[PDB]
Structures are given as structure tokens and as C-alpha cells.
């Protein structure tokens, strides 16, 4: 349920 964008999870 978490996605990663540019190294950060959100």
C-alpha cells in the first residue's frame, strides 16, 4: 500500500 518515488516512500 506504500509506493516509492525518488527513493522516498509515501
Amino acid at each position, epitope marked *: 500500500q506504500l509506493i516509492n518515488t525518488n*527513493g522516498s516512500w509515501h
Partner: antibody
Amino acid sequence: EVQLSESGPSLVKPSQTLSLTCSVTGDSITSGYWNWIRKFPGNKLEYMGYISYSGGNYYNPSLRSRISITRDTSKNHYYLQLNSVTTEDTATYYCARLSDSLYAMDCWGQGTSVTVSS
Amino acid sequence: LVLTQSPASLTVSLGQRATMSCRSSESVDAHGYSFLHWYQQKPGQPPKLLIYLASNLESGVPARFSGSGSRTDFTLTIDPVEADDAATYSCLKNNEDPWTFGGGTKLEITR
């Protein structure tokens, strides 16, 4: 069982481009995160980057200038490219999947040795 | 100082307890998860995931491996140590940029 096979040249001249291919066989690359990791002779592990399920990219800051990770969903392959290589790029390169559930890299390839020399 | 592993090298006898620590220098916690994982690396083999998210045991990994760290302090425990456990172990931090690996802990068996 997810299976990752890596292919590509094992000798690259300096300043030229290193190209490697990772073939995945278990889950689609339209799901999860697909990374490249390399192993220096000192046994140190350096993370390079990934391509995401939607095609997004995240790269290590020290490699962001000369790295590229692309994919081919029809072939279910994703690729690694490293430009302007030097002798410091001689390492064992791995391709691995980062699971959405685990949030860590759980399935790896056996790795391929690449040497940078003239 | 981003990721510091301790000890650098370790020498433990069979059937005993080996303890290693990974220092984060800043929290790797986000959304109630600790994004720190333990990997085992053997010669001529890719890194193998042992513990994911600080304290969960990966499938196929023996119950001898356990993790329990939080915020900035993490620990990997091998008990009892077996002859097959002789390898280098690394912690991985992937909460935010940059994703880094620890220097590693070289564990040697005593006989």
C-alpha cells in the same frame, strides 16, 4: 519462482558505455521495483538505482550523471546503461526485484562480472 | 556517518551467539515501519535477504536469525551460530534518498 538472468559484455574500454540486460521470469515488471546493485572487489555493496512499475526511475546520486535504467514490458526485460566508465566501475553487477510487500530486495540474479580496461 | 556497522570483523565458535549492530545516524522509520534489512553475502553468490523491515524473518531463513532494532539502532542476532553462517552480513537502508549499504560484518567461525 521469480528468475533473473543477466547478460552483456564482460570487458568495456574506458569512457565507453557499459550495457547489461536483466530478463525476469515470474512476475511482471509492471509490478514492483526492479533494481541494479553492484559488488566491488573490496566486498562492498553499492546500490545503483531502479525502474518502477510505472516506469519511474530513482538513481544513486553519485551515478545520476552517467546512469540509465530502461525497460521493455513486451519482452519483460529491463536494461542498465553506464556511460563514461572508468576502472572504478569494475564490479559484479546484480539485478534484483524489490517486493511491494517486503519493501526490500528478495529475488536476485547470480550476477555478471564486468571489467573496465583498454 | 550515514550507515555504520559493528563489529567490522567477528570470530565466534559453533553453537554460540553472534550479535551485530547497524547505526543509522538518522531515523529510517516511516509509516510505522523500520526500513532496515539484513543481508547475508557468501563468495560467488548474490546477497541473500535474511531480515526485512528490522524484525521479520524472510521465508526459508532459519529461526536462528532475528532482528529487533528501532529508529536508529538495529541488531542482528545469530544463535546458535552454525558452520554455514561464515559470511559477510550487511544492513540496507531504504527509507529515503540515498539508499546505502553498510560496510559489512565479516563473521569467522572458531574451531
